[PDB]
Design a protein around this ligand. Structure first.
Ligand SMILES: CC(C)(O)C1CCN(Cc2ccc3nc(-c4cnc(N)nc4)nc(N4CCOCC4)c3n2)CC1
Length: 834
């Protein structure tokens, strides 16, 4: 390649955090094949994107405007403040007025201008009703004013893109590990599993042998499955037991070819189920890791139901996603497959009833799929679609009909589910997949989706040896089409994160309570960085529309919180920014912020769900991005303190919690009596939202040091990485004006809200369960494909009328009353002292 073409790939590499041209850790060309394969989807989408829409990235939705926002518009009038220089003129508008019209009613009171939000790279442009812009909806909910500046549209030139019937068998040669302890005397054997969507088709193990650094077997393992019966995507799973090591090899390759020949596979060690176990990547660390040597030496392609069985069938289909299928259930599902195909909700269980280890059945299964009239006309059910993209499905045709459904998601909804879509790539047998191409397409079509796609990917690439390789191929494909302007923005962001992280680690390795000394070191380090050299503005990775300028080193500090987190403040790079407020970012090692990311995203989904039912529980899912191993960034919400601090103020380092302090804190913090009363109601709304959300997720029992509140009454939980269903302590209860078995107007309001909030979530039980399940598989350590997952099943009272459920939750609230400060107090003894 050219001297400059090389220098382009180094740039990508630095952006990616991984080198997709390195081939030290492959035994085939699937990654490189995927690179070339992804060229066609990339160019297609880049070739088909409107340059101007793309450059301006309008953030819109096609959902109805919630009942709670209509009410704020009691005139069918919407005021917009337009800004030009120092001048400023407000303009009445109809909620249905497109920006081209609003412009046109304005030059009435040279037409190549565009309405941009003040202090943001956010544009109100395009043929969408003014009421259908997310920013406009955001202002309304909060009671904030829509301020827009009239300026020139961004030049799309900046967005330039750089130009057989034999039974299967496998010979296990031996295992090799360089150094083991002396020793103790252990015994070992090799387990070989033919897997498909975590379904084991057959299993053979070798005999036991004393665990030495080299163990040779030279043995053929003969399986019962015929070569012609192997399904594409089946894994050869190789495991060592004393279980200590595992590695996987795809039996059918990306070219539909039977794997053949000599392999030396460096395995992964178990630390002390999860999607890492599924990876087709081998350990990069060839010098320390256990290695296994094997050899391969073996190419592909009615009657109406009796009333009682259908009833039996329907009772099966109506059950939840975590419900086990019996042998009888699968035989029923399958025998009556044609009837089953008419029910979209049956699809996951139906496709779990497939004998994937039998070629004729799979063939019949494909026959089923060609008559997908009922599936293709059905309304998108994201919960349902997601269930087909999890670890239970390895068949690419099955996974493809799910992705097909995702095609109709609009940007607004693709964002909601993006994080978990990206995580779902881990369940893909192959690097190139429909899901992967989908993500690729949607990122290249929309800068906001693309920005978040980038950071999500880069997050896994930086802490996942198991899947970094695959993702990097995908991230590269995206960066080769997002265009020059973004490349630069990304570069800026990456430099910033890499420099601040360096500062973060360096600061932590100085102590374990507070130090005038360490604060002084921090500011000094920041002085060196600010000049020189750190990009002179950079987009905020969790709030892309926002541009951070220069540090306000005076306001920066080291928080006395544990892992010694950096509290950072920035000026806004955009001078057209109304307020004079800084941009606050916490930078912290070492929490596994991936968990925090996932909890917060599900939180945003709960918000969206509630939105469909015209509810606003006032959640505050602040931005959070895991950038690397136990390191990442967190959005600082302005004017917010922890409930714990509120209580350490009036009393010292106790303990002796008081009921009235919180209300007291709100009145002090309220300028008028009108603002106070708004804060009191907002507290009631934000409290209820978190009580419900944390309970359904099983993270309700928290110490109040992990619960915050805004000066405006917005309660919110943080740090997601006897007992209580959630935190509803006397202080919260006092604010609503009640204490100890004494209802009240604000408290009836509270209850009533929770129930509505609760029963609404239950209408989306399956979605919540699949997202939870996946979250656990791709986001938390090894788990139990049983008990962890089942908490939420119990929490959402699966299989009960709305009446029992309402009463279930009210009961949960009563548990809180009865416990009072008992549980907080306990938390205090434990976390504060021992
Ligand atoms: C005592 C100090 C240093 O003078 C400050 C410390 C900051 N506190 C508030 C505070 C404390 C701990 C916090 N901890 C987190 C946090 C979140 N997730 C994880 N994993 N770890 C820590 N987030 C916070 N918020 C969140 C957004 O609002 C502002 C910061 C946060 N705020 C006020 C006085």
């Amino acid at each position: 390649m050219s001297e400059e073409s090389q220098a382009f790939q180094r740039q990508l590499t630095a952006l990616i955090g991984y080198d997709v041209t390195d081939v030290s850790n492959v035994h085939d060309d699937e990654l490189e094949f995927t690179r070339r394969g992804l060229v066609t989807p990339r160019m297609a989408e880049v070739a088909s994107r409107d340059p101007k829409l793309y450059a301006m990235h309008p953030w819109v939705t096609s959902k109805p405007l919630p009942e709670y926002l209509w009410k704020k518009i009691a005139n069918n009038c919407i005021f917009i403040v337009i800004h030009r220089s120092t001048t400023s003129q407000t303009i009445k508008v109809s909620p249905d007025d497109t920006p081209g019209a609003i412009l046109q009613s304005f030059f009435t009171k040279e037409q190549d201008f565009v309405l941009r939000v003040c202090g943001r790279d956010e544009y109100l442009v395009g043929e969408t009703p003014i009421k259908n812009f997310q920013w406009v909806r955001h202002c309304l909910k909060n009671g904030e004013e829509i301020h827009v500046v009239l300026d020139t549209p961004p030049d799309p030139a900046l967005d330039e893109v750089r130009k057989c019937d034999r039974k299967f068998r496998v010979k296990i040669r031996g295992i090799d590990i360089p150094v083991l302890p002396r020793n103790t005397d252990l015994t070992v054997f090799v387990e070989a599993n033919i897997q498909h969507g975590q379904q084991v088709l057959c299993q053979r193990r070798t005999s036991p042998k004393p665990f030495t650094e080299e163990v040779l077997w030279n043995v053929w393992l003969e399986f019962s499955i015929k070569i012609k019966d192997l399904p594409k995507g089946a894994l050869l799973n190789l495991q060592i037991y004393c279980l200590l090591y595992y590695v996987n090899l795809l039996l059918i390759d990306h070219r539909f070819l039977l794997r053949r020949g000599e392999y030396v596979l460096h395995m992964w060690q178990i630390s002390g189920f999860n999607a890492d176990k599924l990876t087709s990547a081998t350990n990069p660390d060839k010098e320390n890791s256990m290695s296994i040597s094997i050899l391969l030496d073996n190419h592909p392609i009615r009657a109406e139901m009796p009333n009682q069985l259908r009833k039996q069938l329907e009772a099966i289909i109506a059950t939840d996603p975590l419900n086990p299928l019996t042998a009888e259930d699968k035989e029923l599902l399958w025998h009556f497959r044609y009837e089953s195909l008419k029910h979209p909700k049956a699809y996951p269980k139906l496709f779990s009833s497939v004998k994937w280890g039998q070629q004729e059945i799979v063939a019949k299964t494909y026959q089923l799929l060609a008559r997908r009239e009922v599936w293709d006309q059905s309304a998108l059910d994201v919960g349902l679609t997601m269930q087909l993209l999890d670890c239970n499905f390895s068949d690419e045709n099955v996974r493809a009909i799910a992705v097909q459904k995702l095609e109709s998601l609009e940007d607004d909804d693709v964002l909601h589910y993006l994080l978990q879509l990206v995580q779902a790539v881990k369940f893909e047998p192959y690097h190139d997949s429909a899901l992967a191409r989908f993500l690729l397409k949607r990122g290249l079509r929309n800068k906001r989706i693309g920005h978040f796609l980038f950071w999500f990917l880069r997050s896994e690439i930086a802490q996942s040896r198991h899947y970094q390789q695959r993702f990097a191929v995908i991230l590269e494909a995206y960066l080769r089409g997002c265009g020059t302007a973004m490349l630069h923005d990304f570069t800026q962001q990456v430099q910033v994160i890499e420099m601040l992280q360096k500062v973060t680690l360096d600061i932590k390795s100085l102590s374990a309570d507070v130090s005038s000394q360490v604060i002084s070191q921090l500011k000094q380090k920041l002085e060196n960085l600010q000049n020189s050299q750190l990009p002179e503005s950079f987009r905020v990775p969790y709030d892309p529309g926002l541009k951070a300028g220069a540090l306000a080193i005076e306001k920066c500090t080291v928080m006395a919180s544990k892992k010694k987190p950096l509290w950072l403040e920035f000026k806004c790079a955009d001078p057209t920014a109304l307020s004079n407020e800084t941009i606050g970012i916490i930078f912290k090692h070492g929490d596994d912020l991936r968990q925090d990311m996932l909890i917060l995203q599900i939180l945003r989904i709960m918000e969206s769900i509630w939105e469909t039912e015209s509810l606003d529980l006032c959640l505050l899912p602040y931005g959070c991005i895991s950038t690397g191993d136990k390191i990442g960034m967190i959005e600082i919400v302005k004017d917010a303190t922890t409930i714990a601090k509120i209580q350490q103020s009036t009393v010292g380092n106790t303990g002796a919690f008081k009921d009235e302090v919180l209300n007291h804190w709100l009145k002090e913090k309220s300028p008028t009596e009108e603002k106070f009363q708004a804060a009191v109601e907002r507290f009631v709304y934000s409290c209820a939202g978190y009580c419900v959300a944390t309970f359904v997720l099983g993270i309700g029992d928290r110490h109040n040091d992990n619960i915050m509140i805004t000066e405006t009454g917005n309660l919110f939980h943080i740090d997601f990485g006897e007992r209580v269903p959630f935190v509803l302590t006397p202080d919260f209860l006092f604010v609503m004006g009640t204490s100890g078995k004494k209802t009240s107007p604000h408290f009836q309001k509270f209850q009533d809200i929770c129930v509505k909030a609760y029963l609404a979530l239950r209408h989306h039980t399956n979605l919540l369960i699949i997202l939870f399940s996946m979250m656990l598989m791709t986001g938390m350590p090894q788990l139990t494909s049983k008990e962890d997952i089942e908490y939420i099943r119990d929490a959402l009272t699966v299989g009960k009328n709305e009446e029992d459920a309402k009463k279930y939750f009210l009961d949960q609230i009563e548990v809180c009353r009865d416990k009072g400060w008992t549980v907080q107090f306990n938390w205090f003894l434990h976390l504060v002292l021992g």
